[PDB]
Amino acid sequence: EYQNIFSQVQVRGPADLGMTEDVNLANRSGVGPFSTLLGWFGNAQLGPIYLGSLGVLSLFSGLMWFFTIGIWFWYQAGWNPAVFLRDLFFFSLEPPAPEYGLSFAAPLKEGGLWLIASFFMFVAVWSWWGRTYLRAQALGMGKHTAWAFLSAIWLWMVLGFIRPILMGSWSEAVPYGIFSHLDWTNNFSLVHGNLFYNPFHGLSIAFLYGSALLFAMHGATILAVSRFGGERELEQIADRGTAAERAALFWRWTMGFNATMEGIHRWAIWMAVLVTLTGGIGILLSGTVVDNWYVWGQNH
Amino acid sequence: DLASLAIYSFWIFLAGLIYYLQTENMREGYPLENEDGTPAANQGPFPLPKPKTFILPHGRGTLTVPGPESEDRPIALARTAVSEGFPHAPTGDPMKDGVGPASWVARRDLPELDGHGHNKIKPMKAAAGFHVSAGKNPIGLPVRGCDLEIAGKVVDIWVDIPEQMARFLEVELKDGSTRLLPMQMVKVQSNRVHVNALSSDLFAGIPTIKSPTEVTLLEEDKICGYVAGGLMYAA
Amino acid sequence: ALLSFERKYRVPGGTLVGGNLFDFWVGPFYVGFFGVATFFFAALGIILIAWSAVLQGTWNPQLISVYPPALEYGLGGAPLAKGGLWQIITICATGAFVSWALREVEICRKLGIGYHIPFAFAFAILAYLTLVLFRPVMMGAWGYAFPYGIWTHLDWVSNTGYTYGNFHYNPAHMIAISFFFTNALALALHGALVLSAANPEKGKEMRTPDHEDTFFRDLVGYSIGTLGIHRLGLLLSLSAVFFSALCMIITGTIWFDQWVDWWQWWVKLPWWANIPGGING
Numbered sequence A: 001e002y003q004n005i006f007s008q009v010q011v012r013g014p015a016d017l018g019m020t021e022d023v024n025l026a027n028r029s030g031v032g033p034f035s036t037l038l039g040w041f042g043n044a045q046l047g048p049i050y051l052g053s054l055g056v057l058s059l060f061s062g063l064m065w066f067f068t069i070g071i072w073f074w075y076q077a078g079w080n081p082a083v084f085l086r087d088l089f090f091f092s093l094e095p096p097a098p099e100y101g102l103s104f105a106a107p108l109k110e111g112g113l114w115l116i117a118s119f120f121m122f123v124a125v126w127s128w129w130g131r132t133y134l135r136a137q138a139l140g141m142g143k144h145t146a147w148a149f150l151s152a153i154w155l156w157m158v159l160g161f162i163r164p165i166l167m168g169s170w171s172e173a174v175p176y177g178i179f180s181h182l183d184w185t186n187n188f189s190l191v192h193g194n195l196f197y198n199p200f201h202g203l204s205i206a207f208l209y210g211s212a213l214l215f216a217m218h219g220a221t222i223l224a225v226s227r228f229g230g231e232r233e234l235e236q237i238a239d240r241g242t243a244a245e246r247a248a249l250f251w252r253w254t255m256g257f258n259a260t261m262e263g264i265h266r267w268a269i270w271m272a273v274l275v276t277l278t279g280g281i282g283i284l285l286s287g288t289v290v291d292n293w294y295v296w297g298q299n300h
Numbered sequence B: 001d002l003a004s005l006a007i008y009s010f011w012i013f014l015a016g017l018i019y020y021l022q023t024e025n026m027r028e029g030y031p032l033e034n035e036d037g038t039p040a041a042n043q044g045p046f047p048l049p050k051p052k053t054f055i056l057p058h059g060r061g062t063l064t065v066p067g068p069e070s071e072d073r074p075i076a077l078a079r080t081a082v083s084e085g086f087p088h089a090p091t092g093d094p095m096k097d098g099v100g101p102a103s104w105v106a107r108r109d110l111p112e113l114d115g116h117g118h119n120k121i122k123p124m125k126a127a128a129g130f131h132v133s134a135g136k137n138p139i140g141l142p143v144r145g146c147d148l149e150i151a152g153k154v155v156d157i158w159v160d161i162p163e164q165m166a167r168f169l170e171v172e173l174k175d176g177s178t179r180l181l182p183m184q185m186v187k188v189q190s191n192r193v194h195v196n197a198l199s200s201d202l203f204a205g206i207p208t209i210k211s212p213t214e215v216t217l218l219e220e221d222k223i224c225g226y227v228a229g230g231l232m233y234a235a
Numbered sequence C: 001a002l003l004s005f006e007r008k009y010r011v012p013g014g015t016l017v018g019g020n021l022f023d024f025w026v027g028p029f030y031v032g033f034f035g036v037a038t039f040f041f042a043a044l045g046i047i048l049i050a051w052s053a054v055l056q057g058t059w060n061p062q063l064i065s066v067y068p069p070a071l072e073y074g075l076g077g078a079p080l081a082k083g084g085l086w087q088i089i090t091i092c093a094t095g096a097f098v099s100w101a102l103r104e105v106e107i108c109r110k111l112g113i114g115y116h117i118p119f120a121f122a123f124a125i126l127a128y129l130t131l132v133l134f135r136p137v138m139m140g141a142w143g144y145a146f147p148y149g150i151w152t153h154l155d156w157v158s159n160t161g162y163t164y165g166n167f168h169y170n171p172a173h174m175i176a177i178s179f180f181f182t183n184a185l186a187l188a189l190h191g192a193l194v195l196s197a198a199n200p201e202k203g204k205e206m207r208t209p210d211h212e213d214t215f216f217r218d219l220v221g222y223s224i225g226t227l228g229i230h231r232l233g234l235l236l237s238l239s240a241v242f243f244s245a246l247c248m249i250i251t252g253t254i255w256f257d258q259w260v261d262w263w264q265w266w267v268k269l270p271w272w273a274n275i276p277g278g279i280n281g
């Protein structure tokens, strides 16, 4: 016995075209090439993908977001390729200055292109969201993936839109740059009196660390019981096998309690979702309600 | 203060969420039992969850959990102490009897079906297209045990079709019958497949399947349990 | 008390040390020699934390803080009240953590499962050891380690981070973060996917694994598979923690400056380094 971390022997057959259910097959692509490389860790098969109206819209406004940032970066580079690569991570598409408040009348070079880029980002994400919902629905599945996606969206919405609006100016939003958004994050914590003292930030961290704890625990557990088909989780839920029993007892004997094959997935979705759920609340409250987390902490 | 109200509310919700999550995680295995199989006085601070039903596909019925539970198999162990907390020792051959790390669960004696209702696990010989596409092909290699002798030769791979993965090697024995060996219990090498869990002479006791081209959920557990069990019981 | 399916698993065997001498359960909990070892180390470490709290004169867990020795102590022992309680508590924590892992190994052996879990937990133990042992030793002083206090250890993160400017610029911290964010994303998606199949739309039979692959394929053009998603979660979370340890082990040992300076291997490269324009021109 080896560790079941990379496969030993890859096996390949006809491409699976997928379940049909109520999927509109007009919108499904053909199968892509198989990948021996991806094959050593997961499935080799690439495709089909589904591309409907919402996915095309999503891809289109996402490419437009990308190119709005792109055209700005080349303009910062003076149209020079070597300044483009040199400073790629230092380029920043910044929001309108505080004096334009919530106005859409900022000049194209002092915030207007940030507004335009944002419009495009907003359409791209919400279309992709309806898409995670619609792909589940077409398959007759639960809407858990769309629901979990909204928790990530909530944080991004707070950072870019809800908090800046409540604060009075787009200038509060996060710039589009690699290094510049890092600087925004550090500045954010500094002006709000140290975000370590934001209790929703400490909860977001407990859940971020707890996500790595839980996926290490669970990833390792399922591989430990793969010798019993433990990764076939759905049939272990429908009909508990010795994999699910040995996994549960490992934890029960280690820490005193345990999950089930289905319920470990409820711990998991909640552990992860709470990261950006508490995170969004802590950012939302910053400067609208609490100016100084450290001071707020000592007092109320 | 609104931040103060929010953190206090969030903590109330999290207590709620944890309690909900613990009860969901009690749908199998509870109520707790004493070592004689009677229910335990103490069941912890969380109530048993109200039953939920799954409708199984392909006419396979429904499962309701929690519900009256039973090993419907006899368990060949005896208690080791009057008081609780001590090991129960195998009364028989723990590998033939399916106890300890040789344990198997009485799963349905029906094969797992894919989305279309076809057996999910089939030998390459019964599954068009399938083939070793990378790494050392095991087929026709000698199967060797932890005793370093040969138990048989690999005559096939049993493949999870939907996942396109090798689940079992089928190994042919001296008398010309065969057994399934879980893929995760073999080290495929240049010249041999080595099976550290079993000596060559424990391969014949691997439970046998009723059909030469399909494996039931019950047989998979017997087979996997037997093979894992050898790590303790063939050491 | 036992789970309804548990008894057939409670056989003798699997111990690494002690034979049948500690081979028993207390309630749900398996004991084993490393179970008594965890007990001895955890008990003593907690007793010393209580002693330290009497020495500090507070019983409020928001206030208790066990500090490592002053930096002047270098790597020597310090008096109990001046860092020695920290050092003995660190030794108890290490033995408790390592002992917990060895007990998991015994539990794996008795249940006949792989050792992935204790192996995965060793990464967490190696990260704690990075901060409290490997890094302080390389820097020459125990006072570099973090204090054992709820809020004080957060002041330590802040002090240490700010010492190197914006720690965000540490490139192994960047890789670690990407792993952490990707891990939570993958955890959210995995729980969602399995649950959306086991709990389908009202008026539907349970979905099969093919629906999970179909769903991900429709969404994204690729499904890693049931086995791959569990390898992936383990890989992401372990790589996150490996890169965390790496980003600290290099900090104050092979790197002493503001982390933003590191990035000049790019900006100041001699050919484009001088071109008029951009952000650094």
Ligand code: BCL
Pocket (backbone or CB within 6 Å): A196, A201, A202, A203, A205, A206, A207, A209, A210, A213, C046, C128, C131, C146, C150, C151, C153, C154, C157
């Ligand atoms: C990892 C990098 C830094 C660090 C940076 C941060 C930051 C930043 C934050 C924390 C926060 C926390 N950290 Mg820290 N923390 C470090 C090392 C540790 C160690 C350790 C032995 O290595 C421990 C026990 C903790 C424990 C804790 C918790 C008090 C709190 C939430 C964590 C969590 O849920 O994670 C995931 C694990 C789980 C979900 C499982 C639950 C385990 C927790 C509840 C154990 C707490 C134990 C503590 C009370 C001591 C126990 C004594 C016993 C009675 C013997 N940290 C290192 C030095 N830590 C957050 C906070 O809110 O501070 C108050 C926060 O914002």
Ligand code: BCL
Pocket (backbone or CB within 6 Å): A121, A124, A125, A152, A153, A155, A156, A159, A184, A185, A186, A187, A188, A189, A194, A195, A196, A198, A200, A201, A204, A205, A208, A275, A276, A278, A279, A280, A282, A283, C157, C181, C184
């Ligand atoms: C100096 C910096 C300050 C600080 C300032 C902040 C600020 C400010 C914030 C955080 C936030 C977070 N911090 Mg902090 N933080 C500090 C120190 C720490 C420490 C520590 C020191 O050990 C830790 C562990 C953390 C941990 C964390 C996380 C728990 C949390 C982010 C969750 C998340 O998943 O975001 C990642 C996920 C998202 C942003 C969601 C994205 C959603 C979707 C819609 C994006 C779509 C993308 C698509 C269109 C594009 C694809 C292509 C791209 C090119 C890639 N911080 C120090 C104190 N921290 C965030 C938070 O919640 O605070 C409460 C936050 O806003």
Ligand code: BCL
Pocket (backbone or CB within 6 Å): A185, A186, C097, C124, C125, C126, C127, C128, C130, C131, C156, C157, C158, C160, C161, C162, C166, C167, C168, C173, C176, C177, C180, C241, C243, C244, C245, C247, C248
């Ligand atoms: C102002 C602060 C600086 C900064 C300064 C630092 C410093 C300094 C450090 C980090 C470290 C980390 N930072 Mg930073 N960081 C900043 C901003 C961020 C941002 C962001 C969004 O801005 C993010 C995502 C992060 C993210 C991270 C993580 C990569 C990493 C912490 C995880 C870890 O090490 O796990 C490792 C896990 C452990 C150590 C847990 C081990 C515990 C185990 C073995 C046992 C404990 C159990 C016991 C006590 C149980 C109690 C019993 C009960 C029953 C439970 N930082 C800002 C710019 N950052 C740390 C790191 O990489 O350390 C290696 C680190 O030292």
Ligand SMILES: CC[C@H]1c2cc3[nH]c4c(c3C)C(=O)[C@H](C(=O)OC)c4c3nc(cc4[nH]c(cc(n2)[C@@H]1C)c(C(C)=O)c4C)[C@@H](C)[C@@H]3CCC(=O)OC/C=C(\C)CCC[C@@H](C)CCC[C@H](C)CCCC(C)C
Pocket (backbone or CB within 6 Å): A058, A059, A061, A062, A063, A066, A124, A125, A126, A128, A129, A132, A145, A146, A148, A149, A150, A151, A152, A272, A273, A275, A276, C181, C182, C184, C185, C188, C189, C192, C219, C220
């Ligand atoms: C809930 C907590 C965690 C979480 C959950 C979560 N995220 C999610 C989901 C969930 C449940 C989804 O269902 C959804 C998804 O579809 O997953 C695959 C998603 C998603 N989260 C994503 C990213 C993301 N999630 C993040 C975080 C998290 N997500 C949390 C940690 C982060 C960060 C910063 O941590 C990022 C960056 C996307 C992968 C995906 C949402 C996809 C989306 O909205 O797409 C709209 C945009 C396009 C289609 C644009 C097209 C491509 C453009 C970049 C143009 C470029 C084209 C160019 C020609 C070449 C390309 C190269 C460039 C990339 C350089």
Ligand SMILES: CC[C@H]1c2cc3[nH]c4c(c3C)C(=O)[C@H](C(=O)OC)c4c3nc(cc4[nH]c(cc(n2)[C@@H]1C)c(C(C)=O)c4C)[C@@H](C)[C@@H]3CCC(=O)OC/C=C(\C)CCC[C@@H](C)CCC[C@H](C)CCCC(C)C
Pocket (backbone or CB within 6 Å): A209, A210, A212, A213, A214, A216, A217, A220, A254, A255, C038, C041, C042, C045, C046, C089, C092, C093, C094, C096, C097, C100, C104, C117, C118, C120, C121, C123, C124, C147, C148, C149, C150, C151, C153, C237, C238, C241
């Ligand atoms: C490597 C990937 C991630 C991971 C994985 C992981 N953690 C794990 C495991 C795995 C696989 C286990 O098997 C094991 C477990 O049993 O989980 C329930 C564990 C574990 N991870 C735990 C905690 C933990 N893991 C964390 C992180 C991570 N764990 C990583 C991100 C973190 C943080 C801060 O991120 C914490 C807090 C425990 C629940 C458990 C270890 C339990 C244990 O070792 O018990 C024996 C010890 C005691 C009961 C207490 C004795 C301690 C005393 C000697 C004194 C305490 C001193 C301490 C240093 C004080 C610090 C105070 C703080 C305020 C700073």
Ligand SMILES: [Cl-]
Pocket (backbone or CB within 6 Å): A050, A051, A052, A053, A054, A055, A056, A131
């Ligand atoms: Cl679509």
Ligand SMILES: [Fe+2]
Pocket (backbone or CB within 6 Å): A218, A222, A233, C190, C194
């Ligand atoms: Fe899973």
